Design an enzyme around this catalytic site. Structure first.
Site, PDB file in Angstrom:
ATOM      1  N   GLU A   1       0.377  -1.234   0.059  1.00 61.00           N
ATOM      2  CA  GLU A   1       0.202   0.122  -0.508  1.00 61.00           C
ATOM      3  C   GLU A   1       1.132   1.688  -0.348  1.00 61.00           C
ATOM      4  O   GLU A   1       1.664   1.488   1.150  1.00 61.00           O
ATOM      5  CB  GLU A   1      -0.961   0.308   1.061  1.00 61.00           C
TER       6      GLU A   1
ATOM      7  N   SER B   1       4.183  -8.274  12.193  1.00 63.75           N
ATOM      8  CA  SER B   1       2.880  -8.594  12.410  1.00 63.75           C
ATOM      9  C   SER B   1       3.380 -10.338  12.554  1.00 63.75           C
ATOM     10  O   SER B   1       3.941 -11.074  10.918  1.00 63.75           O
ATOM     11  CB  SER B   1       1.967  -8.959  12.735  1.00 63.75           C
TER      12      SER B   1
ATOM     13  N   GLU C   1      26.005 -13.324  19.958  1.00 64.55           N
ATOM     14  CA  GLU C   1      27.363 -14.164  21.345  1.00 64.55           C
ATOM     15  C   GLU C   1      25.495 -14.535  21.681  1.00 64.55           C
ATOM     16  O   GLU C   1      25.595 -15.496  22.093  1.00 64.55           O
ATOM     17  CB  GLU C   1      27.684 -13.522  21.680  1.00 64.55           C
TER      18      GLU C   1
ATOM     19  N   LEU D   1      24.667  -8.460  19.116  1.00 64.98           N
ATOM     20  CA  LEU D   1      23.807  -9.819  19.222  1.00 64.98           C
ATOM     21  C   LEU D   1      24.539 -11.554  18.636  1.00 64.98           C
ATOM     22  O   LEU D   1      23.455 -12.266  19.387  1.00 64.98           O
ATOM     23  CB  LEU D   1      23.562  -9.018  17.726  1.00 64.98           C
TER      24      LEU D   1
ATOM     25  N   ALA E   1      -2.088  -6.306  -0.581  1.00 66.47           N
ATOM     26  CA  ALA E   1      -2.188  -7.958  -0.045  1.00 66.47           C
ATOM     27  C   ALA E   1      -3.858  -8.273  -0.647  1.00 66.47           C
ATOM     28  O   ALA E   1      -3.379  -9.854  -0.039  1.00 66.47           O
ATOM     29  CB  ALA E   1      -1.027  -8.512   0.683  1.00 66.47           C
TER      30      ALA E   1
ATOM     31  N   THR F   1       0.939  -7.992   4.872  1.00 71.32           N
ATOM     32  CA  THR F   1       2.074  -7.697   4.021  1.00 71.32           C
ATOM     33  C   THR F   1       3.030  -8.462   4.717  1.00 71.32           C
ATOM     34  O   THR F   1       4.078  -8.959   4.975  1.00 71.32           O
ATOM     35  CB  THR F   1       2.314  -5.995   3.767  1.00 71.32           C
ATOM     36  N   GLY F   2       3.301  -8.662   6.589  1.00 74.10           N
ATOM     37  CA  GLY F   2       4.320  -8.806   7.202  1.00 74.10           C
ATOM     38  C   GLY F   2       3.924 -10.310   7.675  1.00 74.10           C
ATOM     39  O   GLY F   2       4.984 -10.420   8.379  1.00 74.10           O
TER      40      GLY F   2
END
Ligand SMILES: CC(=O)O[C@H]1C(=O)[C@@]2(C)[C@H]([C@H](OC(=O)c3ccccc3)[C@]3(O)C[C@H](OC(=O)[C@H](O)[C@@H](NC(=O)c4ccccc4)c4ccccc4)C(C)=C1C3(C)C)[C@]1(OC(C)=O)CO[C@@H]1C[C@@H]2O
Ligand SMILES: Nc1nc2c(ncn2[C@@H]2O[C@H](COP(=O)(O)OP(=O)(O)OP(=O)(O)O)[C@@H](O)[C@H]2O)c(=O)[nH]1
Ligand SMILES: Nc1nc2c(ncn2[C@@H]2O[C@H](COP(=O)(O)OP(=O)(O)OP(=O)(O)O)[C@@H](O)[C@H]2O)c(=O)[nH]1
Ligand SMILES: Nc1nc2c(ncn2[C@@H]2O[C@H](COP(=O)(O)OP(=O)(O)O)[C@@H](O)[C@H]2O)c(=O)[nH]1
Ligand SMILES: Nc1nc2c(ncn2[C@@H]2O[C@H](COP(=O)(O)OP(=O)(O)O)[C@@H](O)[C@H]2O)c(=O)[nH]1
Ligand SMILES: [Mg+2]
Ligand SMILES: [Mg+2]
Lengths: 428, 118, 426, 428, 426
Positions: A60, A129, A243, A241, A88, A134-135
């Protein structure tokens, strides 16, 4: 030494409206690119202007129209402004297969642009989400392709889990079943964000009876800014991140950690405030401060990763860890004896001009693994099976080319997901 | 004696048990509670969305819950009870109660969820 | 992402005459098509509705369909027909005279071929389509019968777009012809197979809203449709204007429709108040959702407490906090969950537009799906049962060349339609 | 080295309005928290602001509305400002059982907050009445739960006993029967305060013919400030509350001490004044200065605990002890030979700006045990049994979940209370 | 903690017309509902009485009930009806004509179903209810008869809230119809079973207060009710405004009621003086308590020296010292202990509000309970006995469909009620 934030869907771009705003707050960064002295989220141009290393995706244009006509657009490049033209329709089959296939080839090429610009890529994080169109669908399309190209990179998702009592669309449990197994197939780490538990934090820990999606992500992104940018920032105990990706994930398929953060103090609350290291971690163990509608008391702690800001004394942290072992109602597993990993930043946390938390001297993020997360998945499974018994809404996906047996199989993948944290909970 | 008999009967007619749909169902429920010599009345729900499943009674002595009408287990222990609810007459809905013992004020409750027949 | 509003009949042309009357007033546009507003919100999303000509002239992407010029003449001789191009002014002579088989089968089919060319004229000028809008009555000869041939050919052309029509359900109190249940039966016999969704509009219900809730004295056709057009504009501008819950109508059609034949909607509008209670009532979301649940605010004469809610849409307008939105939405679900279906935990879809309407700081719009819509459909069927026996004035349609078992099959579809609600009611 | 004051009901919060005002008088404490140099009643913030360690409980918002909109609200945090929304309707069965149960889970959680903040908790003191609704029922609910959680802490009550001639509500004897046995079950020490005897002190020892509940607690809280804060303050003989609890209570169930204080001098009376230590202790033995409508002459003294302020010479106290043994009309028991415990503070007592007592050089608090207290309990039992014979007002506790036999059982508990001090009085 | 004041009949609508007239003047509020006072005491506790609309407009949470508009018309055409909303303006046509069986049983039952919906409209807008207030007369057909059906359904709805009505006892000197003791008997037959408490109001007693004590020449209905509304507002604002003895009315209902059927109250107002004695009298608490004990300050024509005091409520207003309060309260108990019941040591409940009323620096309000209230009840019973024999104009109620043994059972409840006072008299 670089990584890229990814914002997929209507939700994650609105999160990214807060994130890169907070990322300008990291160094006092002007809307053109001017900042005095850091290149991890940025590419620096010849005129001294720094542009984000971000991914903006929506089918969108309207949310993209908010970005490219809003603030910080001089920071923003149309390379990152990747929009679609057809919705979507909140669908998985249109997100993953039908509508998303026309855009993904343009998207992955822009990925190959920015990743080639990077020197020492650590990975990425995707913001979306579970029940969106889309997510969820296109994210399932995107994480599948990035795992093919970049297998040995960080595959993070900080995802939004819909409330069992609050859902903006009915198909949000109907979408997330197909989303989850594909997410488990590819992702290195995935979080769950429930707005309902954040609503309890706003009305109590900040006493805000009027929150918006802006003001929610102000809380969420401030945590993520302490999650992401701070682990590269220099402190007393510098851990990245990756480790955590070995330490917080001892499992083949266990990577659903609980991200918590509880210095959450209103401006009027801060005048009567003196919170030590231990007193905040006591608030980290509150059920009202878990960011997910769940009960930690019924779940078994697998891990506890502690992320710190500001005024931190590690000897007092050593007392605070012993305080955790003293106050034990945690039901910690026997598979790891005492694995409580600590991350310390010397740098003070940031406060939003316009935010609703006051200036604090320290900030404590806590990452944890528990078995009560599957109860929220048990909330999800009862929603889908009743819709699968009635076979409602199935014509929107069979007409888009989906199979009924795929739906129950992903439910069996959802059932095997509940089998995964059962085997953690049963055996010790 | 001490009963929530009128309170459950007031929560009966409002929103919980009937509109026009379950009007043959409520006439059994009136016929059950009038013959019932038990005092405390308990409402079993499926979920927090206030979906009625069973109407129970507290004995007080053994602290179990017996079925007069509805679909559910025959007996329910307090270990089977997960959460307990309170009906507000003025707000005309069920409000959640924090953790306490099983008291006469408890008008409604819910169970764990695993106890349902799969 | 554009919309074509093909208006049909004496009613739906005049119904839609109030519609674009709102739309130009929604965006501050001159009656000749010149923009005079001051917002980019009124400036960016012009494309969805209007075709910009040279020199700031906005062509309304809407079609006036009738076999008589007279309704369109009053549009043209009156204000706001000046923005309409004469290419939108398509008619024949004479009218069908509210006759279905004259409209759908014999006479109107010749004009539709000229009309669908103008559709092909506009659709080639369109860059990105989203769906096509219609407006008529169920008892309209030229309104429904021609439109049933329109949607049947557009679905042959464009199966992918949003196919909605806004049809007026015939009132038991408002009657002009006796073969009006013949027209509504033959409509839904094709409106199920050809359309994606529609609304149910009862002027008799709209009589009570003006009178019992708004305390209005003389409800004219425009004043009733001014209530309708505000509900019409409340739906699709949320797709256009920005919001937190940017819900497509195609997103709405997925969420509202569990069975593909069951796509009938119950519209409602929450901020309805008289002029005296303007100084007596505060504007809150629990005030609106109470008025959302109100049976006296329903635009169709159906009892929502009698049937059970299949799906509910919550179209919202204004600067609202989500905690005020989500909890009060849940409070209604905590209130009358017995009026829902059992097998869905969240039968309410929330749709929040952040952009407020003019004048009022907040607004809301109810769109519901219940099983009690068949109560108006039993008014259609039982009146058809007596008329199929005695066959009074059927020689009008019989000379057109229609068959009675076709009417029985149209009754059988109505026999299916009532039964399909009863399968999902209990 | 810390403890928490508790204010339950309409009465005790109005007492706490005077007490923490007097506690600001202890060090010249500003209404924000500013004070130069002491952390026993206080938690200190990093900005140099001290907040009380107090408990504010009411089921009515209006008394809380007076606090949170009045003075010292910048000292007070809403963690302590715990209000209810529905009244107890002056009922025990609503205070203890019906209405009070909805708040106690929030209250005890706030207790666990502040008690975790304390280092070396000595105990607590509860301020309430015997015949109220909140200060009797919910106090019976509160002291029951605190005795479960914190068994080895100090459980104090400084309670208001209604006059046999003045009662503001008729159910005040009808409440305190059920209150008393539950109080005896849990409390470590409980006082009785009769406003009627305080009325006699104000009209004579201060000559105030217009007293209010504000002015009464000015007299009451000044004693309690010398009772509580002074025993931690450094003096010539530093004794705390806990050494009294063994010494003043040699009994399993005997802990009803008589708190007396008689330097009570008006501002005009101070010019015609020269009082030694012994002359004040003679005024401590006056029946008009007992703070309870009772006659010490008919009661047998079990104990005498002397608490001192200011100008104290212990050799003169030793003469004053001999003066007590010389002027004997006391009828002291043979169970203890000569037990007259002394507490001495070197620090001078404080005077309210706006109070009605003049500046004195010494202040003498006397704690005593006598057997004439049960005569005031005998006033209580005659009130209840007439109402129990008529069965008037029984439809508000058999309207709220009580049993008839429980009333007579608590009356037999009240009878056994009279049996307790009978065995003290009879045997020697 | 909010109050709804449902006003009924020609009387109780006009009685409560003076009430909110005081209440808006109590808090300094415009007749349109705009606040213009200067106190936070007039600003914080608005919630108990008023509903705040947008732009500082306060909706009186009070319902005007009649089967005739004319009383509410005079409220609306007069001042202070402009603060009232038309949702409070609910009526039918025609009136019952002071008829119980028309009001309670046949005609008024249809309107109450619309009224109780508006009760449900307001109660959902209410956050926290404390109790519902009513006001009528005992001989009011639409006043009591509709109210007897109101309280019977509200107690079915809300068993938990404070149920008080303010009913006017019929005067032996004031009569308009002969079947007025029929209506009072049928009221108390249901008012005992359905209410929690009530007051006893005699206009004949209020005639003496204006004339013998206040020396007023022409007592109108509003002038009588201005005496009433000051006593009405003296009770419940003490719950609202702060005080040292913050006594709930529900605290009062426990402390005043020893037997659940014996809940009838004798109101009184202590600072009653004429205009000439303003320069002749000082304002002290023993001046007030003397005028509390006065038989000539009682609002009901009953002898307090003949019967014996069951319970006494001492509602106080002002900045009084408790020693002046408690000792003078004891001095009355030392004076007239023979006028008390034996089995209670303190038959007087004290209730002190620290907040003074306007004008006078101190005020007080007597509320008593005695066994001599049955004297007016014997006026009802004995007049009912003669009328039950001859049954004059009973065909008005007989054609409504009422039974005589129902009236005898209502007499039997009155036969119970008088006997219950003799239980606690001696
Ligand atoms: C002084 C003032 O502003 O008064 C208001 C007003 O008081 C009331 C009475 C308005 C008014 O509407 C009517 O009286 C009316 C009568 C018959 C049919 C339709 C409307 C108003 O006309 C309507 C108008 O609403 C709007 O302007 C909305 O933006 C609305 N637009 C139109 O209705 C419109 C009007 C003229 C021309 C074109 C459009 C809208 C709502 C949603 C989506 C798009 C547009 C407003 C605020 C007012 C008046 C003038 C009295 C109400 O309507 C609306 C739609 O807001 C009726 O129920 C509300 C309650 C309002 O309080
Ligand atoms: N915390 C938070 N949640 C949001 C925000 N915007 C949307 N959501 C949540 O996202 C979910 C709805 O998903 P959508 O964003 O509409 O869907 P999508 O993934 O963008 O894809 P489409 O459906 O195709 O538009 C709900 O659970 C919302 O609560 C936001 O700004 N913050
Ligand atoms: N000395 C003194 N006594 C007080 C004060 N306030 C109330 N009292 C006494 O307390 C008793 C009344 O108890 P309340 O405080 O009203 O009751 P409660 O315990 O707060 O609970 P509720 O009845 O439910 O409001 C009487 O004996 C009063 O004399 C005060 O400030 N000082
Ligand atoms: N709301 C509304 N309904 C109308 C209007 N004109 C006609 N109708 C309704 O539409 C039906 C008649 O349809 P009509 O438009 O005359 O048929 P046509 O021959 O297709 O034009 C009846 O149900 C009328 O009540 C109007 O202006 N407004
Ligand atoms: N104090 C007072 N009593 C009134 C008033 N109007 C009527 N009454 C009394 O109330 C009774 C008549 O009640 P009414 O309201 O007219 O009956 P209804 O309207 O038919 O219910 C008689 O006892 C009258 O004396 C008034 O304004 N003030
Ligand atoms: Mg989206
Ligand atoms: Mg109190």
């Amino acid at each position: 030494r670089e990584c890229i934030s990814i914002h997929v869907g209507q939700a994650g771009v609105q999160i990214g409206n807060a994130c890169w705003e907070l990322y300008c707050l990291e160094h006092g960064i002007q809307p053109d690119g001017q900042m005095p002295s850091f290149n991890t989220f940025f590419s620096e141009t010849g005129a001294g202007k720094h542009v984000p290393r971000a991914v903006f995706v929506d089918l969108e244009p309207t949310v993209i129209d908010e970005v490219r006509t809003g603030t910080y657009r001089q920071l923003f490049h149309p390379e990152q402004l990747i929009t679609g033209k057809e919705d979507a329709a909140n669908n998985y089959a249109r997100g993953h297969y039908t509508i998303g296939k026309e855009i993904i080839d343009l998207v992955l090429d822009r990925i190959r642009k920015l990743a080639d610009q990077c020197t020492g890529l650590q990975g990425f994080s995707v913001f979306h989400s579970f029940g969106g169109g889309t997510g969820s669908g296109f994210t399932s399309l995107l994480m599948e392709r990035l795992s093919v190209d970049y297998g040995k990179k960080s595959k993070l998702e900080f995802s939004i889990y819909p409330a069992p009592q609050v859902s903006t669309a009915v198909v949000e449990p109907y979408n997330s079943i197909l989303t989850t197994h594909t997410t488990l197939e590819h992702s290195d780490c995935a979080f769950m964000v429930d707005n309902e538990a954040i609503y309890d934090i706003c009305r109590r820990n900040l006493d805000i009876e009027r929150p918006t999606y802006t003001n929610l992500n102000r809380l969420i992104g401030q945590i993520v800014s302490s999650i992401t940018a701070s682990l590269r920032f220099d402190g007393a105990l510098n851990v990245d991140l990756t480790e955590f990706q070995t330490n917080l994930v001892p499992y083949p398929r266990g990577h659903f950690p609980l991200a918590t953060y509880a210095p959450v103090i209103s401006a009027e609350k801060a005048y009567h405030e003196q919170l030590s290291v231990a007193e905040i971690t006591n608030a980290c163990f509150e059920p009202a401060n878990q960011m997910v509608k769940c009960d930690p008391r019924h779940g078994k702690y697998m891990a506890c990763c502690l992320l710190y800001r500001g005024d931190v004394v590690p000897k007092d942290v050593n007392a605070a860890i012993a305080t955790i072992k003293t106050k034990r109602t945690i039901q910690f597993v026997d598979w790891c004896p005492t694995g409580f990993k600590v991350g310390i930043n010397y740098e003070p946390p940031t406060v939003v001009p316009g935010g609703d938390l006051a200036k604090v001297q320290r900030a404590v993020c806590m990452l944890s693994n528990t078995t009560a997360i599957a109860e929220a998945w048990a909330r999800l499974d009862h929603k889908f099976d009743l819709m699968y018994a009635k076979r409602a809404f199935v014509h929107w996906y069979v007409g888009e080319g989906m199979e009924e047996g795929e739906f129950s199989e992903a439910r069996e993948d959802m059932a095997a997901l509940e089998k995964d944290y059962e085997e953690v909970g049963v055996d010790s | 004696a001490k009963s929530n008999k009128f309170i459950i009967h007031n929560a009966l007619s409002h929103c919980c048990l009937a509109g026009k749909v379950n009007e043959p169902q409520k006439n059994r429920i009136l016929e059950e509670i009038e013959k019932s010599k038990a005092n405390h009345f308990l409402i079993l729900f499926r979920d927090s969305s206030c979906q009625f499943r069973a109407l129970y009674t507290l004995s007080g002595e053994t602290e179990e819950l017996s079925r007069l009408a509805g679909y559910g287990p025959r007996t329910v222990t307090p270990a089977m009870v997960e959460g307990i609810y309170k009906y507000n007459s003025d707000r005309k809905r069920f409000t959640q109660i924090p953790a306490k013992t099983m008291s006469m004020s408890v008008d409604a409750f819910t169970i764990q969820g695993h106890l349902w027949q799969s | 992402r554009e919309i074509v509003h093909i208006q049909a009949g004496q009613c739906g042309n005049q119904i839609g005459a109030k519609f674009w009357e709102v739309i130009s007033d929604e965006h501050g546009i001159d009656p000749t098509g010149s923009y005079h507003g001051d917002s980019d919100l009124q400036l960016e999303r012009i494309n969805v509705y209007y075709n910009e000509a040279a020199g700031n002239k906005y062509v309304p992407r809407a079609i006036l369909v009738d076999l008589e010029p007279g309704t369109m003449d009053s549009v043209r001789s009156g204000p706001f027909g000046q923005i309409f191009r004469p290419d939108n002014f398509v008619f024949g002579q004479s009218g069908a005279g509210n006759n279905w088989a004259k409209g759908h089968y014999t006479e109107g089919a010749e004009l539709v071929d000229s009309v669908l060319d103008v559709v092909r004229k506009e659709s080639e000028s369109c860059d990105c389509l989203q769906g096509f809008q219609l407006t008529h009555s169920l008892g309209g000869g030229t309104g429904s019968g021609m439109g049933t041939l329109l949607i049947s050919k557009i679905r042959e052309e464009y199966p992918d777009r949003i196919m909605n029509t806004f049809s007026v359900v015939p009132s038991p109190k408002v009657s002009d012809t006796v073969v009006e249940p013949y027209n509504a039966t033959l409509s839904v016999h094709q409106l199920v197979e050809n359309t994606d969704e529609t609304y149910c509009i009862d002027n008799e219900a709209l009589y009570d809203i003006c009178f019992r809730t708004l305390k209005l004295t003389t409800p004219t056709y425009g004043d009733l449709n001014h209530l309708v057009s505000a509900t019409m504009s409340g739906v699709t501008t949320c797709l256009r204007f920005p919001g937190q819950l940017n819900a497509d109508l195609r997103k709405l059609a997925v969420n509202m429709v569990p069975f593909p034949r069951l796509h009938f909607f119950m519209p409602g509008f929450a901020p309805l108040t008289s002029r005296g209670s303007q100084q007596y009532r505060a504007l809150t979301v629990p005030e609106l959702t109470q008025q959302m649940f109100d049976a006296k605010n329903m635009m169709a004469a159906c009892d929502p407490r009698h049937g059970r809610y299949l799906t509910v849409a919550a179209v919202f307008r204004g600067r609202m906090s989500m905690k005020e939105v989500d909890e009060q939405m849940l409070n209604v679900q905590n209130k009358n969950s017995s009026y829902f279906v059992e097998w869905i935990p969240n039968n309410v879809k929330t749709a929040v537009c952040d952009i407020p309407p003019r004048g009022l700081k907040m607004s809301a719009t109810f769109i519901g799906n219940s099983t009690a819509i068949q109560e108006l459909f039993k008014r259609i069927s039982e009146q058809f049962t007596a008329m199929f026996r005695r066959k009074a004035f059927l020689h009008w349609y019989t000379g057109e060349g229609m068959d009675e078992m076709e009417f029985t099959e149209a009754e059988s579809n109505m026999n299916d339609l009532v039964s399909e609600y009863q399968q999902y009611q209990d």
